[PDB]
Design goal:
Blueprint (H helix, E strand, L loop, with lengths): L1 E10 L3 H10 L1 H8 L3 E8 L7 E8 L2 E13 L4 E8 L7 E12 L5 E11 L7 H24 L5
Antiparallel strand pairs: 1-7, 2-3, 3-4, 4-5, 5-6, 6-7
Helix pairs in contact: 1-2, 2-3
The structure holds (2E)-2-methyl-4-(9H-purin-6-ylamino)but-2-en-1-ol (4 copies) and calcium ion.
Keywords: Allergen, Calcium, Cytoplasm, Hydrolase, Metal-binding, Nuclease, Pathogenesis-related protein, Plant defense
Main location: cytoplasm
InterPro entries: Bet_v_I/MLP, Bet_v_I_allergen, Plant_def-hormone_signal, START-like_dom_sf
């Protein structure tokens, strides 16, 4: 089956600046900002489509990682699309999970981070609800941490 979900994250940070932090400077800013992410590293590629990034994080006390494959990267339109192409642990009901993200102008000069999540399962298997909730909660924490960090360090590098 194919399932879609929509998240929106509000930020006080202006969209092009937030995109720069999330995308262009991800490898530097994200580990600094996000207290559960230890590193964001390029495994292969030049930064364009097909690039694989390894994001190492702590969960339940254990060091784990996920691999992201860049599907599209469009700074002009503040777009970034990627898929998850590896991780730690046994297979589950997800055959594939991918993301289409866009940043747009929000309130008082801030942003809204839009995310469409596409989950593909085998046959009539359903997405795991607890996981979706946890994933969204991580998304909230991720944007909060980035907002707090960029508020405290509006300049950098
Ligand atoms: C940090 C990574 C993915 C999470 N990125 C984003 N997650 C959510 N919204 C966004 N807008 C621009 N980039 C993103 C690395 O693939
Ligand atoms: C897999 C299911 C929910 C998991 N998804 C979400 N759970 C919580 N908040 C959300 N916002 C957009 N999607 C979600 C429904 O069983
Ligand atoms: C911040 C991001 C994703 C977090 N949201 C979700 N990630 C995974 N599954 C889900 N179901 C509903 N929302 C989600 C994109 O990088
Ligand atoms: C890009 C994001 C998170 C990086 N992925 C994860 N970050 C932290 N703990 C996890 N458990 C499963 N996946 C993760 C957005 O929340
Ligand atoms: Ca960190």
């Amino acid at each position: 089956g194919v399932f879609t979900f929509q998240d929106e994250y509000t930020s006080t940070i202006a969209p092009a600046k937030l995109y720069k932090a999330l995308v262009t400077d991800a490898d530097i800013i994200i580990p600094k900002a996000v207290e559960t992410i230890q590193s964001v590293e390029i495994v292969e590629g030049n930064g364009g489509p097909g690039t694989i990034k390894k994001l190492t994080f702590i969960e339940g006390g254990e060091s784990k990682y996920v691999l992201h494959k860049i599907e599209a990267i469009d700074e002009a339109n503040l777009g970034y699309n990627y898929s998850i192409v590896g991780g730690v642990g046994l297979p589950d009901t997800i055959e594939k999970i991918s993301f289409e993200t866009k940043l747009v102008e929000g309130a008082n000069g801030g942003s809204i981070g839009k995310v469409t999540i596409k989950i593909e399962t085998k046959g009539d298997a359903q997405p795991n609800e607890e996981e979706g909730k946890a994933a969204k909660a991580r998304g909230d924490a991720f944007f909060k941490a980035i907002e707090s960090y960029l508020s405290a360090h509006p300049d950098y590098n």
